[PDB]
Amino acid sequence: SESVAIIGAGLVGCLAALAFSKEGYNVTLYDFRQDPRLDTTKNKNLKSINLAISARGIDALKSIDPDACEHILQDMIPMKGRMIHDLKGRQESQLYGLHGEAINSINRSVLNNSLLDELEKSTTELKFGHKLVKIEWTDDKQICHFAIGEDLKTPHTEKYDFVIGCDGAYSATRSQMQRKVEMDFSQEYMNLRYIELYIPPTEEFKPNYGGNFAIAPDHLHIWPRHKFMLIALANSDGSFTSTFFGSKDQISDLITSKSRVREFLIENFPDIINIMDLDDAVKRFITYPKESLVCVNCKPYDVPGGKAILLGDAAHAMVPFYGQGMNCGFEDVRILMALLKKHSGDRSRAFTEYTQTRHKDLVSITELAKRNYKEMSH
Numbered sequence: 489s490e491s492v493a494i495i496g497a498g499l500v501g502c503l504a505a506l507a508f509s510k511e512g513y514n515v516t517l518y519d520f521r522q523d524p525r526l527d528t529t530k531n532k533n534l535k536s537i538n539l540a541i542s543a544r545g546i547d548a549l550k551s552i553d554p555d556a557c558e559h560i561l562q563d564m565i566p567m568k569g570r571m572i573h574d575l576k577g578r579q580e581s582q583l584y585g586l587h588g589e590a591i592n593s594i595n596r597s598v599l600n601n602s603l604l605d606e607l608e609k610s611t612t613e614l615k616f617g618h619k620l621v622k623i624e625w626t627d628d629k630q631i632c633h634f635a636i637g638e639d640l641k642t643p644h645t646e647k648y649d650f651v652i653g654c655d656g657a658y659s660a661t662r663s664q665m666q667r668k669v670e671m672d673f674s675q676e677y678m679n680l681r682y683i684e685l686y687i688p689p690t691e692e693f694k695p696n697y698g699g700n701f702a703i704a705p706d707h708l709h710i711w712p713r714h715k716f717m718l719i720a721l722a723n724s725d726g727s728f729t730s731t732f733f734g735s736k737d738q739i740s741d742l743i744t745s746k747s748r749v750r751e752f753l754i755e756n757f758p759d760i761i762n763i764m765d766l767d768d769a770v771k772r773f774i775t776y777p778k779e780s781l782v783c784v785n786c787k788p789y790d791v792p793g794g795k796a797i798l799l800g801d802a803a804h805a806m807v808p809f810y811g812q813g814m815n816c817g818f819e820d821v822r823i824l825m826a827l828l829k830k831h832s833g834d835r836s837r838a839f840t841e842y843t844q845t846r847h848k849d850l851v852s853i854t855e856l857a858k859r860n861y862k863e864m865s866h
């Protein structure tokens with residue numbers, strides 16, 4: 489009957505809620521955003537249209553609800569390797585070897601909404617429009633303060649036995665913990681910026697691709713260039729979500745004129761005009777929201793009395809593409825629930841061991857992602 493407040497309803501917070509729901513906790517899930525499932529919610533906070541979910545990501549979901557997981561991952565698209573497109577438009581297929589991990593394309597909106605639908609079926613209370621503003625820590629029940637609704641009111645308070653921060657890279661929960669526990673902490677803002685482009689489905693079925701795909705759906709497509717990159721991952725309807733990645737200065741330098749963007753696109757990626765509308769590409773490029781990307785590390789991840797813990801981007805936000813934040817966050821949840829099961833529900837011991845065993849793995853995954861990016865960008 490122990491109570492837990494889970495701060496943040498992104499991918500990792502929903503998975504965590506589903507996790508704790510099923511173990512028999514009374515879960516309340518909070519997020520300052522409105523419900524993304526609602527027609528009236530205009531900003532769905534989707535950092536990307538699709539994602540590469542790996543074997544670890546998949547397993548973690550499977551270990552929490554195999555029956556729903558089957559239907560949740562129904563329309564994912566398995567990848568067999570990477571397809572490299574050189575400057576001349578030549579394509580080379582590079583299949584996934586004995587060091588590389590296999591991945592699947594899945595739609596972000598569909599995953600996150602489907603998790604919310606499983607939560608709706610569970611005992612979990614969903615509280616949208618609730619912004620965590622403060623935690624009062626005690627040796628029994630932590631006091632959470634929220635503000636509600638626009639000119640944010642005051643959801644008075646509620647008390648919970650413990651708190652899980654899944655509140656993203658800018659975690660309010662994390663700051664509150666820092667006032668209670670000496671936390672080693674770093675934040676590094678990357679030079680990276682990304683822009684989403686669109687490759688439409690073909691008009692006709694393409695028998696050799698098994699759908700209306702302009703290029704091969706079973707490859708992650710990559711156009712590697714000097715300090716920048718284009719990628720494309722298939723969507724269910726035959727389209728591809730394409731993403732351009734480079735330094736902010738390069739991008740800021742390009743978007744000063746539409747013809748400069750266009751010529752840049754034609755000169756690099758010449759095989760893209762056969763499958764993409766250049767004018768729509770130029771407009772997307774110039775107007776796609778500029779988003780800061782921060783990388784963080786924490787130690788420890790927990791407040792000592794088993795009172796709180798940080799999972800997902802709140803704990804270890806990393807470089808996109810070179811790192812896999814969602815997969816790592818899913819793995820976070822799987823690892824924590826096994827530790828709770830192992831210690832018969834003893835939070836104090838479980839959270840403590842999580843920090844002792846997880847930190848070294850995460851320092852490594854996140855440093856490797858930083859290093860792989862650093863090398864590309866220099």
Ligand SMILES: Cc1cc2nc3c(=O)[nH]c(=O)nc-3n(C[C@H](O)[C@H](O)[C@H](O)COP(=O)(O)OP(=O)(O)OC[C@H]3O[C@@H](n4cnc5c(N)ncnc54)[C@H](O)[C@@H]3O)c2cc1C
Pocket residue numbers: 495496497498499500501518519520521533535536538539540541618619620621654655656657658659660661682799800801802808809811812813814815816817
């Ligand atoms: C372009 C791009 C591509 C990516 N591709 C992949 C990929 O292919 N594979 C992969 O594994 N990862 C990928 N990632 C990383 C992945 O998107 C993230 O790691 C993952 O979505 C983070 O999940 P989260 O639940 O921890 O955080 P978030 O998605 O940030 O969710 C946090 C939630 O907390 C809420 N919140 C914040 N503050 C408060 C507050 N004070 N009170 C209440 N709620 C609050 C926010 O509203 C938000 O909804 C990609 C990232 C980017 C940017």
